[PDB]
C-alpha cells in the first residue's frame, strides 16, 4: 500500500554475508571466552587474518568460513542447552568430558574433533 511502502521501502537495508559471518564468530569467540589463538586453532587462521575480518569479511564460500559456521553452531547449541548461561557454556568447553573422551575445546582444535563436539551437542538437542 501507499505508506505500507514508505517505510518498508524505508527499512530494507541489505547486509553482506561475509560481514555478518565475521561479526558473528568474533562475538561467539568472546562470549565463549576464547583467546584469539584458540579461535585461530579452530578455523585455521593466524591472528593477522582475524584483524582483517573487519575490513573485508570472512568469506563464507571459503573453507575457513565453513569451520566458522561450525564454531558458531557450537555456540548456538551450547547457548540453547545451557539456557544462555555463559559460565556453564565456557565450563563445558574447558572441562574434560566423559562422552567426548577429552576436553571439548581441545578437540575443536582439529577438524574431526570439532565435528564430534558439534554432533554431540546436535544430538542432545532433538532429544530435549
Amino acid at each position: 500500500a501507499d505508506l505500507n511502502w514508505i517505510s518498508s521501502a524505508l527499512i530494507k537495508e541489505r547486509p553482506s554475508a561475509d560481514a555478518v559471518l565475521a561479526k558473528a564468530v568474533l562475538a561467539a569467540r568472546e562470549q565463549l571466552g576464547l583467546t584469539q589463538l584458540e579461535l585461530a586453532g579452530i578455523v585455521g587462521v593466524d591472528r593477522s587474518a582475524i584483524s582483517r575480518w573487519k575490513t573485508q569479511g570472512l568469506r563464507v564460500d571459503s573453507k575457513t568460513g565453513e569451520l566458522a559456521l561450525l564454531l558458531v553452531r557450537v555456540y548456538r547449541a551450547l547457548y540453547a542447552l545451557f539456557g544462555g548461561q555463559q559460565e556453564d557454556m565456557r565450563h563445558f568447553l574447558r572441562t574434560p568430558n566423559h562422552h567426548l573422551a577429552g576436553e571439548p575445546l581441545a578437540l575443536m582444535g582439529q577438524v574431526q574433533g570439532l565435528v564430534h563436539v558439534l554432533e554431540y551437542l546436535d544430538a542432545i538437542r532433538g532429544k530435549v
Binding site: 555478518v20 555456540y75 547457548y79 572441562t95 562422552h99 554431540y120 532433538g126
Partner: protein
C-alpha cells in the same frame, strides 16, 4: 536381528496410527541474535549456518521445519536406541507428554553427567517447546505387545543398544515405516514411537506448540509451562540412576 527372526516380524507388520509428542529446543534463534546487531542480519546468519548442516533427506524437505529437523541430524556416537550413527536417523517421540518429559529429563542428565566436573551454576534454567502431531503408516510394528514383548527387557536395556539397534536395521530392511516401543526411562512405563520415513505424518503443521520452562540441577529435572500458571513436574535423577552413575552405552 535375532529378535526379528525369532518373532517372525514380517508376519506381524500391520497398519498403525496415533498421535505423537516430543520436546525440542526453543532458544536457537535467541542464541544467534546475541552474535548480531539486527534481525535482518540474524536471518541471514541462520541461513549461512544452514548451508553447513547435514543435508535434508529428499523426502523430508517439504515438511515443516520442526517435523523434518530430526531427520537431518545424526544421533550420538553410540547411536540411538533403534538406529546407529551410520544409518538414517529416526524421528523419536512419545505417545504421552509425561513420557516425552521423562525421556527429555534423562537426556538433560546425560549432558550434565558428561562433564567430569558438574556445571558450576548448579542450576540451568532452559526453555523448551512441545508439539503434537498425527502419524499413520501402512506398515507398522508394535514392539510392546505380541512376540516382541518376550524380548521387551532386552529392548528396554538402560545402557545397551546392540539388540534394539540390530532390530532397527532388520525392521528398516523389512520395509517398516514406523513402530511403537516401550520407553526405557519413563517411570510410568509409557511407550514411545519412532518413524523411519517422513511420509508417516498426516498433518502440515506441528500442533499444540507449548512453551516450557525447565530447571536442571544435580538432583532433579523440572518442567512447567512458560505461558500459563502451573505447578512444576519433577523428574528426579533417581528415576534414571543405577548405583550412583547415569547409565548409557559407552
Amino acid at each position: 536381528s535375532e529378535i526379528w527372526r525369532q518373532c517372525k516380524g514380517e508376519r506381524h507388520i500391520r497398519p498403525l496410527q496415533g498421535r505423537l509428542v516430543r520436546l525440542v529446543e526453543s532458544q536457537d534463534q535467541v542464541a544467534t541474535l546475541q552474535l548480531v546487531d539486527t534481525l535482518e542480519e540474524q536471518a541471514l546468519l541462520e541461513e549461512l549456518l544452514e548451508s553447513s548442516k547435514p543435508p535434508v533427506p529428499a523426502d523430508a524437505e517439504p515438511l515443516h521445519y520442526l517435523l523434518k529437523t530430526p531427520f537431518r541430524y545424526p544421533p550420538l556416537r553410540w547411536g540411538s536406541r533403534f538406529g546407529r550413527r551410520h544409518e538414517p536417523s529416526l524421528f523419536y517421540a512419545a505417545l504421552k507428554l509425561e513420557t516425552a518429559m521423562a525421556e527429555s529429563a534423562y537426556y538433560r542428565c546425560v549432558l550434565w553427567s558428561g562433564m567430569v566436573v558438574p556445571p558450576p551454576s548448579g542450576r540451568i534454567l532452559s526453555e523448551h517447546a512441545s508439539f503434537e502431531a498425527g502419524w499413520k503408516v501402512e506398515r507398522g510394528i508394535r514392539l510392546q505387545a505380541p512376540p516382541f514383548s518376550d524380548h521387551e527387557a532386552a529392548l528396554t536395556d538402560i545402557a545397551d543398544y546392540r539388540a534394539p539397534q540390530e532390530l532397527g536395521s532388520a525392521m528398516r530392511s523389512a520395509g517398516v515405516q514406523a513402530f511403537e516401543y516401550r520407553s526405557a526411562r519413563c517411570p510410568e512405563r509409557g511407550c514411545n514411537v519412532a518413524l523411519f520415513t517422513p511420509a508417516a505424518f498426516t498433518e502440515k503443521r506441528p500442533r499444540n506448540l507449548t512453551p516450557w520452562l525447565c530447571e536442571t540441577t544435580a538432583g532433579y529435572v523440572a518442567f512447567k509451562p512458560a505461558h500459563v500458571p502451573g505447578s512444576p513436574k519433577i523428574f528426579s535423577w533417581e528415576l534414571f540412576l543405577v548405583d550412583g552413575k547415569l547409565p548409557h552405552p559407552a
